[PDB]
Amino acid sequence: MGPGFDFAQAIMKKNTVIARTEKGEFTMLGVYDRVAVIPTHASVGEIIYINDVETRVLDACALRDLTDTNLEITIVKLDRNQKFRDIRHFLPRCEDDYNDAVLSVHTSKFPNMYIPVGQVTNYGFLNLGGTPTHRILMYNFPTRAGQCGGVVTTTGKVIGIHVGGNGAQGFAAMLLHSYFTD
């Protein structure tokens, strides 16, 4: 509808796949080469389905901060025959608050879904499903089951992936440039 949705659409059309684990179907953001991200609660194993194709997980990693606190981001390297467009230059370098964000989802259940969630707070600490979690972004939209892994963007920035909600608010794990240095 506007330049927010334009940038979100550009990310969804080239940098997302549908990831299936034993814990369900997730939006999965591809970042560069064969490297993607997913919520740690997806419980990635040795094998994952990518757009309904059986794919070996060459490597995977559940990120924690230097206080050894959950970040709820898993970085996955896929045994896939094709690279993602490199979008690392759209990742923020520091923790921040944002205005006018869009949460975008693409699954079997929720194809081509875009939600204007408005103002994003650097919330910090959240007890997420009973797990102490750091670097949480908060937005005042009543998000629901099926949106986890959803991509949170502003015009020109990919800032996080959706990892939970409480019925009134939605929560995203930050994406930082420093997670994907090579």
Ligand SMILES: O=C(c1cn[nH]c1)N1CCCC1
């Ligand atoms: O930490 C990383 C990573 C992030 N950006 N590049 C590589 N990985 C661990 C699982 C496979 C990739």
